[PDB]
Amino acid sequence: MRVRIRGIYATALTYLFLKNGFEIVQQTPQIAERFFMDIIRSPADVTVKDGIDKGEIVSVGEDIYNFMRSIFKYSPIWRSPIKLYSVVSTEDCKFMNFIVEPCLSEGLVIKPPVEGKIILSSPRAVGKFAMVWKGDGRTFFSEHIDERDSQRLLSVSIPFNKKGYNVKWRSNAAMATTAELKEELENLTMRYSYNDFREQGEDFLKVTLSLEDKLFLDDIRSLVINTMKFHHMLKMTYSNEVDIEEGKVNPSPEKLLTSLIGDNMIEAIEHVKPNGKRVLLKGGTIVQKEIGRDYYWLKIRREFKSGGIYDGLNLKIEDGDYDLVELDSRNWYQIHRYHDRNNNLKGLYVNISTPPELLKNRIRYLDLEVDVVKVNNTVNIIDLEELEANKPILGEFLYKKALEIAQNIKDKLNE
Ligand SMILES: [Mg+2]
Ligand SMILES: [Mg+2]
């Protein structure tokens, strides 16, 4: 299969796709040079790029799920049951088990249901190179079409604009022969006029990368060009700063890591659920930290006001209650020590997760559902059934690893 790759993971991903037999196409000149390969100006069967959040990789086109699940063992992967750019029929503003927006009775899926919500637009006939529908008769271009390639495309779609068809050129169109393009618009306009959208959808998946797989990608990228530890994690906040440091004699991520939690304050903990939803949890003051060449550790103090129950502990939250949270880049867990205003220990909550990432004034981790709670000398592994519910997207390796950690923590808490 021919694959097109963009975004902060592109070098590491290019290595791994090559290593697994894919044809790389539409390389940038800088990718071509790094892999000593020719730029192939051919359409891609599948496109891999950053998600809306740079901590995600998305894939659109042919299904590569089984391949992605074997590269990324320690990351949730969601395969869309709904093909992107399919056309669906709606009732009561629902399609199957999903909400749609807007509430079109017939609509083109333009965003998959990552969290149970499908984004629609008015139907269009979609091929690999173009989308067509009825309108004024205008030609639109993907952002990723160079100007040198636009005029050829316009010459093809102008006739169809005259007929009242809007034409959206997709970036793959720039690599297609002119005869392919003409055939494409002939077929698309004909299918549109018959209201025929069968089999037009494209497969979609999203990898929510853990720090474990980001470090694996740092290692892979290291085989091609100079790469610091935490390179990809830092590329969520920094751009050229990371490359500058990687040109130095012994590159270290220490200063850029320190800058993220510069002022010893965490405004929020991003608790990422298996499905990708980022849940903001209360932050606090960094009372102690250690940032080295290849790891970081922090102790955060979180202040609580009256209100509610502490999850797992089943204890009421009182004014002046505080949490001492220990987290470490090498650890798949955070130890929360819950105290009252007079420093009395209320309980211990061990949050199980993928290794914590650093963002500007924020911590991020992929929560693994199972937790371990200790109150007095009661030590309980909780929410095993919620880890089970999330096994299809977590995959078996994260699932097994969260069971090992849980057992380990219980044994330690019981000593
Ligand atoms: Mg948890
Ligand atoms: Mg829970």
Numbering used by the authors: 1 to 415
What are the paper's exact sentences on this?
Finally, in vivo experiments in Haloferax volcanii suggest that this RNase participates in the maturation of pre-16S rRNA.
Two magnesium ions, two phosphate ions and two bound dinucleotides from the co-purified RNA are visible in the PfRNase W structure and only two magnesium ions in the SaRNase W structure. In the PfRNase W structure with a 5′-phosphate dinucleotide bound in the 5′-sensor domain, the central domain with R10 completes the recognition of the 5′-phosphate through a double hydrogen bond interaction. Instead, R10 makes an H bond with S171 from the 5′-sensor domain. We hypothesize that the difference in conformation arises from binding and recognition of a 5′-phosphate RNA, which locks the 5′-sensor and S1 domains in a productive conformation through the specific recognition of the 5′-phosphate by R10.
